[PDB]
Write a protein that binds this ligand. Structure first.
Ligand SMILES: CCCCNS(=O)(=O)c1ccccc1
Length: 117
């Protein structure tokens, strides 16, 4: 992807901790990236965890859209803003479910945009 290699070390520790906390496998992360998302806490709570770690969402999974936009290439920022227009605010039964709903909304609307590290 566009995702530059310097992010993967930026995220490394948070990734390990989030996967550990949530019972997440790499296989599940791979699936979300190839389009396949289910409402399983091991993956949905992983995405919430990682978003939180980078201050992209609050304690109720409200998305900080400015921070979110500022971590994207200006190439995408346009298309991202468009997708957040549609898919924000978040809604759901809990923080994990809220991010499931968001991922799903983005994936349907913009395939290029919802990547998971
Ligand atoms: C727009 C898609 C956000 C969800 N992806 S992510 O949670 O893996 C993530 C990506 C980049 C930084 C932090 C978390």
């Amino acid at each position: 992807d566009w995702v530059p290699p310097e992010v993967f070390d930026l995220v490394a520790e948070d990734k390990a901790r989030c996967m550990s906390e949530h019972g997440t496998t790499q296989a599940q992360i791979d699936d979300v990236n190839k389009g396949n998302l289910v409402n399983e806490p091991s993956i949905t709570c992983y995405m919430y965890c990682l978003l939180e770690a980078f201050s992209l969402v609050d304690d109720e999974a409200n998305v900080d859209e400015d921070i979110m936009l500022g971590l994207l290439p200006d190439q995408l920022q346009e298309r991202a803003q468009s997708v957040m227009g549609k898919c924000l605010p978040t809604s759901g039964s809990d923080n994990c479910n809220k991010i499931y709903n968001l991922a799903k909304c983005v994936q349907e609307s913009a395939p290029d945009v919802w990547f998971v590290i």
